[PDB]
Amino acid sequence: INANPGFWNGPFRYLRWSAHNRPHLFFAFAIGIAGPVAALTLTPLRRKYLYPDHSPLPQSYPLPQRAREGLTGFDD
Amino acid sequence: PSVGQDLPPVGGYEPVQWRRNLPARGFRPLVYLAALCGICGYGFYRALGGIQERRELKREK
DSSP states (O other): OOOOOOTTTOHHHHHHHHHHHOHHHHHHHHHHHHHHHHHHHHHHHIIIIIOOOOOOOOOSOOOOOOOOOOOOSOOO | OOOSSOOOOTTOOOOOOOSOOOOOOSOOHHHHHHHHHHHHHHHHHHHHHHHHHHHHHHHHO
16 A cells, blocks of 8 residues: 655655656656746856847837938939 | 377477566666657757747848
């Protein structure tokens, strides 16, 4: 029988126990917990170690802020 | 008397195979897992670089 020790008696033993008896829960849960934790910790490292981000893609015609100078050429 | 009926060989027969012929073929399961992660990670290296490539092509268009 492999009924229960309880999560709140010994954690790491219960983690081993669930990995031996119910991997359908725990190996979905491990892939699930590895998502956001790695998402938090790895993204400072990649900007520090691997490579920084990309330049943002323009979404419309980019408008500068100038004053409509005198531009000659192609009157007629 | 007894003549002409069939009999076993005087040397007898060879011993036959009656056990579980079950070889534990293949590799260690950890080798399958490590090869899985290798095939995955090489695929991701081909994937995400091509995606960033496609994003730069999108910028160029």
